[PDB]
């Protein structure tokens, strides 16, 4: 959830999965 990554986390919201901070 709450992220810039195109994928989702657990809440279905944009995940914050990136290669750098």
Please give the Cα distance from 12 to 5 (Å, whole number).
12
Q: Report how far residue 6's alpha carbon sits from residue 16's, in angstroms, rounded to the nearest whole number.
A: 8
Grouping H, G, I as helix, E, B as strand and the rest as coil, residue 2 is coil
- How many whole angstroms separate alpha carbon 1 and alpha carbon 5? 9
14 near 4, Cβ under 8 Å?
Answer: yes
CB atoms within 10 A of CB 15: 17
| Structure tokens that stand for 8 in this block | 């989702």
Reading the block at residue 10, the tokens are 């657990």
Output the six-digit token pair for 19: 């290669």
Per the entry, the structure determination technique was: NMR
Burial class of residue 11, CB neighbours in 10 A (0-12, 13-18, 19+) = exposed
Identify which of 20, 19, 1 has the alpha carbon closest to the alpha carbon of residue 10: 1
Q: What share of the chain is helix, strand, coil (3-state, %, to 5)?
A: 0, 10, 90
């Amino acid at each position: 959830s709450l992220g810039s990554s195109p994928y989702n986390d657990i809440l279905g919201y944009p995940a914050l999965i990136v290669i750098y901070p």
